[PDB]
């Protein structure tokens, strides 16, 4: 449980954004403040984050294995036929390997800002992702 991430998507613009394809390849997804309460990625599939709302994802390594947390998701634009906005990848591996947080993709109608990631040894930490559809 030393390897964990909290990802907070904050819609700071005026247009809805949508999450799809959340998947942890290592570790689990869990409820806020509750690593023992696992949650399904399907609870997030297609969820809309409205203006000024936040959506929180919590992921951690396994309780009974030397396994960190790794995963991906996409943000898409529900006003534009779920057009891809950005792809996201996280990795907080068990052991000495540094952490990774990677945002990728091109959709010039959107601005995406993130901060909080710990790229050194230890947990990736709490990453806030602000989203804004440009006017
Ligand atoms: Na690590």
From Swiss-Prot:
Any GO BP annotation: symbiont-mediated hemolysis of host erythrocyte
Short name of one Pfam family: Aegerolysin
Key words of the record: Cytolysis, Hemolysis
Assembly with partners or alone: Monomer.
Family, as annotated: Belongs to the aegerolysin family.
Biological role stated in the UniProt entry: Has hemolytic activity against bovine erythrocytes at nanomolar concentrations in vitro. Promotes active pleurotolysin B (PlyB)-dependent permeabilization of membranes rich in cholesterol and sphingomyelin. May play an important role in the initial phase of fungal fruiting.
Stated name of the protein: Ostreolysin A6
Name of the encoding gene: OlyA6
């Amino acid at each position: 449980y030393a390897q964990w991430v909290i990802i907070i998507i904050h819609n700071v613009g005026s247009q809805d954004v949508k999450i799809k394809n959340l998947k942890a390849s290592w570790g689990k997804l869990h409820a806020d403040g509750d690593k023992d309460a696992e949650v399904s990625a399907s609870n997030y599939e297609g969820k809309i984050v409205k203006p000024d709302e936040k959506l929180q994802i919590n992921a951690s390594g396994r309780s009974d294995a030397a396994e960190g947390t790794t995963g991906t998701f996409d943000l898409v634009d529900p006003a534009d036929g779920d057009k891809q906005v950005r792809h996201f990848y996280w990795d907080s591996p068990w052991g000495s390997k540094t952490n990774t947080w990677t945002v990728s993709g091109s959709n010039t109608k959107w601005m995406i800002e993130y901060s909080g990631q710990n790229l050194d040894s230890g947990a990736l930490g709490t990453i806030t992702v602000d989203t804004l559809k440009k006017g």
